[PDB]
Design a protein around this ligand. Sequence first.
Ligand SMILES: [Cl-]
Ligand SMILES: [Cl-]
Ligand SMILES: [Mg+2]
Ligand SMILES: [Mg+2]
Lengths: 434, 434
Amino acid sequence: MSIEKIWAREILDSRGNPTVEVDLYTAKGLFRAAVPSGASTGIYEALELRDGDKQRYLGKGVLKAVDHINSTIAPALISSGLSVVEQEKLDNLMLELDGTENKSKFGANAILGVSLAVCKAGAAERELPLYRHIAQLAGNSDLILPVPAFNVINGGSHAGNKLAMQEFMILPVGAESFRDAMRLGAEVYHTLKGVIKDKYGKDATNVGDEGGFAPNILENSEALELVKEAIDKAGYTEKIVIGMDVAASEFYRDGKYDLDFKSPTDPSRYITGDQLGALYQDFVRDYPVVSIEDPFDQDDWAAWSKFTANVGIQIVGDDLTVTNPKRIERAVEEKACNCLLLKVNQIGSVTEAIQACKLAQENGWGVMVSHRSGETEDTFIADLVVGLCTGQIKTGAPCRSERLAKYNQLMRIEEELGDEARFAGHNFRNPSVL
Amino acid sequence: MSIEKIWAREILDSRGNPTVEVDLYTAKGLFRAAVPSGASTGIYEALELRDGDKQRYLGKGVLKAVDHINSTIAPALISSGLSVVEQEKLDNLMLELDGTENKSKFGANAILGVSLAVCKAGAAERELPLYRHIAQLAGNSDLILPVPAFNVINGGSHAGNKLAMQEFMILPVGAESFRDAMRLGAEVYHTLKGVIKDKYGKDATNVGDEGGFAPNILENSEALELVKEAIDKAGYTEKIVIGMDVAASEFYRDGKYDLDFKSPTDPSRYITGDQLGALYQDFVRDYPVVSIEDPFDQDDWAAWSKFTANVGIQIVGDDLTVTNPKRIERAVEEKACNCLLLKVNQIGSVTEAIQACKLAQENGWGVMVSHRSGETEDTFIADLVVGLCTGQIKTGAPCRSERLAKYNQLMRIEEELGDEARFAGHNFRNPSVL
Ligand SMILES: [Cl-]
Ligand SMILES: [Cl-]
Ligand SMILES: [Mg+2]
Ligand SMILES: [Mg+2]
């Protein structure tokens, strides 16, 4: 039925920075959701609203976004009399009320927070589990549990090591179930900790923002060997496969790519995108690498299209698609990649995230639901990846509970589905065949 | 009313290790609670039950504890027809079915999981928030919000550095509210990150299990100077004081203490308890140290009593008391300390945890509700510290959401209390005066 009350507030995300949380009240009770960390800048992605008061949290407060929800958005959604099940009606109503392209008036963080609470409220109004309600919102009926991608080795701008490539992930594609995929990822993560401890010292086992280790490693080959070693030490050689998030936009320097970018700028090491693909092909031929994210710059479309047709593995767009539908339309016709990274807070609403996913799915693309580096204890994307039938989610290492809360919820979803549960397994790119 | 169903399962904690989760159903719905990591061996404390299957999670599985809940504990509590408000009855009934003193048959994790879920369900049966139901179980009426103690610098066993003492904490005693205390902690925490990255390098900024930093330093005095420097640069010298957990059992050897342990062994550097107390005295005099946990070994009673009687600061028992009433009785008699650390899973029952807290407060002790090194997304202890009117809690750095979940939940309790909300402030040791 109607929305009776909406109250928002400030909370701290997994890094100690402010973010938006929204309580939405209907007749059925309280429905709470929180928003992961995004960017208040950028041409394409929707922008979170930050206060900018440097005395307070060094300008990262979200008091203005919280106020936009409580004072302006709440009375508008209450007056509409719309049922909480009408997800697209409510999301479009807040889109026009904001009236901007990138949601810059209220902030993508303010709009998403209400949109997520609406969906949870509409799921209980439907007497459905959240993942089921999302599936009906997306026109799906056969549900699937995704293959998790655990960030276990970090580099690039994320860590103090000279390692240029951002994320080295593990995919338990050979697991019996999702709960079994957790045991595989967790045991390999614990094995990797001992490998790093013995090889690099006891001080090298502390973790980054999403729970992965950051040993002072120069070259990515040793990162892949390190992961490869831990998989084999744990005894899961053919059950677990490696995925990569290069984030090559971070070290695109002077037209070339600098995988020694923590150094004083020096022309001596930078190589061309063509030569970068040769290292990738050597990565793919030497290592079980099935997925590479941001292999080139967000505007170096020539190398992107040239790499996708040349290769057969999954190439996922993060910085070049920014969950932006019109940018995705370009990458389709340009065949720059074959997989979409779905950061719901980069687009700002549940409706637009569903349509962005279905847009990629109708074009034979894969989709990978993604966390943010700044997360909360919210577990919405766990139900999201099940209802969207995406088949693949990355939401951190099996360490730090802003990551495990999603993984734990996916295990609860599998247990609830029971015999109707399907694990994507080796079909994480196209789970619609199971 | 009667319990309809109790279903237990295995989830991953913040380190990636399995732990117990319990779903309890009544006519008012589902009530969920997860257990933090405890200990499986120990002479005094309640013991968690581990599977021991070295092939599965390296023996860390809790399938046996889960089976004890689903097969044995659940049928008996439902058969009793006891109302879920009867916390003491249901906890007692589980204590006798287990039949052992340290909860070693069913496991302290199995018994606590049910006990927590019973408490959340009892609060809804009373149509009260959880913290207010805990207050009525403890015989309290006027609630208090605690001063947070944020772990910020780490040494001891769980750190790769040379630093002997375990934790260095910050306490925003001068804050205006709990929410302001979260702002002060986060701003100092982020400030110290900058001071560490500038002095020790960008690779020294990663975090341990509790969310704090662990730079490679040997002198405990340097750690205190680091924290003091971060407090001053944030501009909060007036408002933030320092607490310590030395965890002296870790470097207690034959009859001395080795502050250069986790190093090549040399008994010549060993220092006596008097020498260690003199080092503490210089800390209190040179730094705003207001609290010291485990200053001496778990059985060095003479050092405890002598140091407590010759000092004015708070002296916290952790390994000394292990949340055990008989150990607390001896600690009160010999005046070994003046503050109890309350780890709920170290005692294994809500009813007994309330007893252990009311025993300490009756003797003029302070109480500090505590997290564990392995936490979950559960937030029970946030409502617990408020309901027990304890005035102080340590549940991590303002980093990693297994820590922020309690801190955010305390912020929610503060705004729900409205004008009735009181911040312990400078009376965190004796909040009853407010
Ligand atoms: Cl990110
Ligand atoms: Cl602990
Ligand atoms: Mg990325
Ligand atoms: Mg301790």
